[PDB]
């Protein structure tokens, strides 16, 4: 069936209403470049002009366009949702509350107003997306995500290094293996020089998810026809290439007729391209995009279902936590503190059901630092320190003095090995902070995934984070001093009593004693850190939380709920209902589609 | 060889000064009983009256009678050893110089006066022997040890424990395996009743080294007969029994000619002893004693030669130490401090040439403590002993919570292994104390063998010993704290990162971790102890010595000297000369006796 796309659209609008996350469900992301009239193509598909276009960047903020296939039957069921104004091809904004704008001039004016208000004179990066639900009968069910396009020469007033930021934003958006890359390039510049195809190949060298679009098919008269480009024989695309005659900004701003432009484009394609005319059309292009999106949804159905189940479980836990009455504050807060301490201890030991060997965090990261980081850093130093025998001879001569060399002075050895042992001090401290910082990464990590009950009340989460940070800061100097004392004992007092022959003996003693000291440090420092820092704090975390979260009335402050938090709770309950409905709908589909 | 006899006597006048007999040597020790006529027999043997008369107790201090036959050959062994003596017949004391006693009565009076002065009014026994050498043409070369006689009158100013003191003094001499016990036995009663026989059976029931001389024969003329005791039918001996008549004190005090007494004794022996008349006598007793001594010297030739050479070398080294006293206070003190520091460092290295006669070469012993003693002590403390079913059950139930336990919680295992490891603190302190005692023994070795010149100045010796001991004792607590910290660190770390069933699992894990911790502590703690104690002392010995000993107002007090030290040095020089002479005399024998 084709209800999967409407279900995804419902999920997306719910996510936007509840602060949509970066992890988005399968959607078509459009990437353009210089002289790319993406907005013109979207208007041609819609059949009316409703967005501002421009060479390269059309809107300097992310734009979410939901083309809803609202047939004549559903016109009265969708126009009546808000206000009383109704039409056949109409757009709704959720960033701007209600106020349906049937007239496209109002939509353009609102877009310009918001762009000026937010982006300002210099157009930077705005992670907040812009949502616009378009309803029309001609348009098929589709979800388009428009972002600034990669351009060698930035258009308008923007940072000269904005190209890297745009590329990183596109990579972040298409990181999930569910986005359909709609590549739009100007016929004036070869696709090889275009950056959109470069990024598409970087994320996917094969054209398994990239649809190349050739625009500006009006200037080919002054040059060469794009027939070869559409065929795509230099860099074949496994999905195909569709080209249309893009409309200039001047004509669009003059309130032109979209039907005339579509007719001219169709005639041009039919004449210049005897074969690339059946599928190179607005309706055909929209249907091809919808089919590609459906294919991607079919491919990602297992991962999509896994993500949906994870989100449903998270929201169920959030609802269960939020519904607990504040009655009996002491017992509930004590239970929450005990649960948080148990989760933290399990994460330290790795027994918590949120971290595995695949993911580096908590105990796993500490073990990696102790074994690989610290061990490899210590091993990086050569046993002799890389000093040539000439240096050893010079040191021996300097220490012994101007007398014949017949007895080996051990002090010379002490002068050299120490220098190497001192170099072992720096990595240890570097590791200690890496461990300390790692503890900090735990504090939020659980709250990010495990202890959402902390996120329920921001005050409680902040207080717990501050208490844990203070405990870590108090324990850091003690562990650091103990490690430094161990290093000092192993460094200052080494001794051997605990010309060529003298140099050889000194070098051998240096190597042997340095290896022994390195082994001792490797065996001791991690164990000392576990003693003073990890093991000591494991059980003490619960006691510290209990003693710091309750003096006489601190419980009320911790469990404070904000109005924004209440709104988020309501939106999350709505999201939970939507997730339950989506899971019920998906359960109808057989497992044949989950492969 | 005659020269072999006097030299041994010189040894008896040197080692006995420092205490007991350092080396067993062929010698004659006279042991008497109550109412013993030893004085008369000795006077008859000497040919003149030179000892106190009377029976029972006649001398209160160890008196040595060293008769030397006059001969030009022996002169080299007499004048060279002493400051110089030459006369016809005379007695000389090694404790006195520049005075020759040509009259034996004067010798006896001087001996009595010295004994009274040293021992005071008391008749007890003092720890100070007497040296006496008698030269005459009618005395065979023989050395005897005339110990204080037995007294049966404990009452009076003399100590009530005189018998015990006399027994201990006699034992100190006869305990040597090379000594020959001349037992003076009273013929009035059975030989066993005599104290000499009683003491003889304590360690030498065979009597292989016991030569019996029967006294108190004057009163045996009427009544009981002494023939039974003379024949040895009471306590037979393997060497023979000699009968000498006890001369009356009154007759001797009246200036009785010794020749007349000898004639009377010979007549009495002929009349009363037909079996043994010319075969028994004081001269025959002296000849038998000399024969036994010479035969024992012949038997001990190899070992005696080796020991004499070793002692000669050692005393030459001591004289070299005693050779040149301090000439410049500051320079001599600095040289002594530097030499002491070097010797201490060498001893710590376990390679110093100077070594004791009872232990290892100082620092080497310390290594042994770290190898076998400490390891065996640690292994003696088995992991089992502190675990029982009741305590294990209680710990498991407490760790699990308010519900029964059917698993193996890690907290209980960690607590139990920590408690077991805490038991390892005591062996560490034992090893540290052993190392400290070894260092004290090294200090004593340096004081007594390597720094005899330091001994000459007792103040400096005491100051150095006290300073070193105080430094070691002050470094001791720091090492103890470091080892305790190491033990505490080694027990908290968890190495697993890289009801009967539960109890058995807990016990096995505890045993494994305890063994691992024992290995780790045995590998580590010795290094820390050497760093804090061995290396630190090696580095700071000179600094501490300079800081504590070097002063501008202690040179005179530290370097005090006394004439007694000069006398002891002269005695040591005489000892060295006598040892060299004995070595030269003994080096004239063939080599077949060595194998």
Residue numbers in the entry:
A (entry chain A), B (entry chain B): 1 to 498, 640 to 736
Please quote the paper that reports this structure.
Here we present a cryo-EM structure of a full-length Drp1 dimer in an auto-inhibited state. Using cryo-EM, the structure of a full-length dimer of WT human Drp1 was resolved to a reported resolution of 5.97 Å and a 3DFSC resolution of 6.07 Å, which prevents the identification of side chains but secondary structure can be observed in regions of the map. Conformation 1 generated the highest quality map with the most particles, the best fit, and is used as the model dimer after applying a low pass filter of 6 Å to remove over-fitting artifacts. Overall, the architecture of the model dimer presents a compact organization of the GTPase and stalk domains, resulting in a ~ 100 Å decrease in length of the solution dimer when compared to the length of the crystal structure dimer with the VD deletion and GPRP401-404AAAA mutation. Specifically, hinge 1, comprised of two disordered loops that connect the BSE to the distal end of the stalk, adopts a conformation that places the GTPase domain near its own stalk. Comparing the autoinhibited dimer structure to the published crystal structure, the G domain of the cryo-EM structure is positioned 79 Å closer to the distal end of the stalk. The residues that form the discrete dimer interface identified by the Daumke group remain at the core of this dimer conformation;9 however, the density reveals additional burial of surface area between adjacent stalks in this region. In the solution (i.e., “closed”) state, L2S is juxtaposed to α1Ns, and this interaction requires a conformation with an obtuse angle between adjacent stalks (ranging from 103 to 145°) to form a more continuous interface. Helices α1CS and α1NS and loops L1NS and L2S would prevent the dimeric cryoEM structure from forming either interface without undergoing conformational rearrangements.
Mitochondrial fission is a critical cellular event to maintain organelle function. This multistep process is initiated by the enhanced recruitment and oligomerization of dynamin-related protein 1 (Drp1) at the surface of mitochondria. As a member of the dynamin superfamily of proteins (DSPs), controlled Drp1 self-assembly into large helical polymers stimulates its GTPase activity to promote membrane constriction. All DSPs have two common domains, a GTPase or G domain, where GTP binding and hydrolysis occurs, and the stalk, comprised of the middle domain and GTPase effector domain (GED), which together drive self-assembly. Dynamin-related protein 1 (Drp1), the master regulator of mitochondrial fission, has a unique intervening sequence adjacent to the stalk called the variable domain (VD), composed of 136 intrinsically disordered residues that confer lipid sensing.
